[PDB]
């Protein structure tokens, strides 16, 4: 037998807020959050948004939880997450933007889920990114500071 640790089966992430966003102009209605969890680029689950917060509170403080398994989560797939923008008009539909991307290593350097609340910053999209979640985009924390960051709780119960 053991002890029993580590025995996690359901990954459940909640987002705080976000940083020195991408919103200039004072046009933009909404916003909210694209996260998922790819393989070598594909695809392995349905992916998950976050509420829609206005640009001038990107706070979120939402309860995330992901259609994944912790014990059939493979070591290449990762977490990636994307901040866009939606603004429509009246009888018009809304229009959904790319702003930042973000890919964290679900599994540590030393094949641990990672844990503890984490803040860090987002790469720029490319020019009018076509998609709006980029899971082929790099993994880590951008050094640069102009650039956006976007806070989440790391929590792992069943």
Same mark, same amino acid.
């Given at each position: 037998?053991?002890?029993?640790?580590?025995?996690?089966?359901?990954?459940?992430?909640?987002?705080?807020?976000?940083?020195?966003?991408?919103?200039?102009?004072?046009?933009?209605?909404?916003?909210? !959050?694209?996260?998922?969890?790819?393989?070598?680029?594909?695809?392995?689950? =349905?992916?998950?948004?976050?509420?829609?917060?206005?640009?001038?509170?990107?706070?979120?403080?939402?309860?995330?939880?992901? =259609?994944?398994?912790?014990? =059939?989560?493979?070591?290449?797939?990762?977490?990636?997450?994307s901040?866009?923008?939606?603004? @429509?008009?009246? @009888?018009?539909? #809304?229009?959904?933007?790319?702003?930042?991307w973000?890919?964290?290593? /679900?599994?540590?350097?030393? =094949?641990?889920? !990672?844990?503890?609340?984490?803040?860090?910053?987002?790469?720029?999209?490319?020019?009018?990114?076509?998609?709006?979640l980029n899971?082929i985009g790099?993994?880590?924390?951008?050094?640069?500071? #102009?650039?956006?960051?976007?806070? /989440? #709780?790391?929590?792992?119960?069943?």
């Amino acid at each position: 037998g053991s002890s029993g640790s580590s025995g996690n089966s359901a990954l459940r992430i909640k987002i705080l807020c976000a940083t020195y966003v991408n919103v200039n102009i004072r046009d933009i209605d909404k916003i909210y !959050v694209r996260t998922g969890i790819y393989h070598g680029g594909e695809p392995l689950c =349905d992916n998950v948004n976050t509420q829609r917060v206005p640009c001038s509170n990107p706070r979120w403080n939402e309860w995330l939880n992901y =259609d994944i398994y912790i014990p =059939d989560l493979p070591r290449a797939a990762r977490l990636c997450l994307s901040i866009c923008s939606v603004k @429509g008009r009246k @009888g018009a539909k #809304e229009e959904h933007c790319p702003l930042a991307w973000g890919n964290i290593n /679900l599994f540590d350097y030393t =094949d641990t889920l !990672v844990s503890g609340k984490m803040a860090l910053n987002l790469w720029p999209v490319p020019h009018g990114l076509e998609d709006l979640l980029n899971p082929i985009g790099v993994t880590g924390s951008n050094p640069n500071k #102009e650039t956006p960051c976007l806070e /989440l #709780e790391f929590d792992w119960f069943s």
